[PDB]
Amino acid sequence: NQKLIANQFNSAIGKIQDSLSSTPSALGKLQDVVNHNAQALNTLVKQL
């Protein structure tokens, strides 16, 4: 069934572009690290 397995794989890699592209919480785990660090620094700068 090589031709279908190859097309299903080829399409799924195609959808992965869109699902990553639009949904907001897709890159949430990486973004939360960046935000958590910035708030921690900002409180320190404000506690001055």
Q: Which residues bind another protein (CB under 8 A)?
A: 42, 45-46
CA distance 2 to 10: 12
Q: With respect to another protein, which residue has the nearer C-beta, 11 or 35?
A: 35
CA distance 39 to 16: 31
Q: Which two tokens stand for residue 15?
A: 């959808």
Least CB distance from residue 36 to another protein, whole Å? 17
Q: With respect to another protein, which residue has the nearer C-beta, 20 or 41?
A: 41
Owner of token pair 């958590």:
36
Q: With respect to another protein, which residue has the nearer C-beta, 4 or 45?
A: 45
